[PDB]
Amino acid sequence: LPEIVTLREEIDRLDAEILALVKRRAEVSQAIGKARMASGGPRLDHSREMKIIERYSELGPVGKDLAILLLRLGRGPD
Amino acid sequence: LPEIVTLREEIDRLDAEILALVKRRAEVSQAIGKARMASGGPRLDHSREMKIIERYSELGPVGKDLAILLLRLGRGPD
Numbered sequence A, B: 001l002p003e004i005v006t007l008r009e010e011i012d013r014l015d016a017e018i019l020a021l022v023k024r025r026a027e028v029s030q031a032i033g034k035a036r037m038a039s040g041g042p043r044l045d046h047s048r049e050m051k052i053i054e055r056y057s058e059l060g061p062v063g064k065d066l067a068i069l070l071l072r073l074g075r076g077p078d
Helices: A002-038 A046-059 A061-073 B002-038 B046-059 B061-073
Strands: none
Touching: A002 A061, A002 B002, A002 B046, A046 A061, A046 B002, A061 B061, B002 B061, B046 B061
């Protein structure tokens, strides 16, 4: 379709930004993981993680799955 | 942990931006879906969608799943 060329541009721009933000979030999450590890004790703040998941549910059920994936991106490289 | 207070702030800020970007992407994707529907013919550009998925694999295997979820967010509300 010729009339979707500019919509596709916008997608590509959005994806560039999403990827940068997700990468940064993975770095921050991993730093939080390293501080929690270093301190012994729970590897997650479960109440905190559940609240994040509930925020993402504003998007629908796919929103919960997104938060779940972002949670997995916070793991140490394994 | 007291030393993770500012890291948690950064997460919250990143999540605010991720959610706004994902919502916008869902709007654009749905507009592309509506143009494709209106035109009859394939509901997806499969080569295009596969290229998006491959870009997201730069993140790892979780990256492919992310692209997959974003693809589902582009559906008409159902």
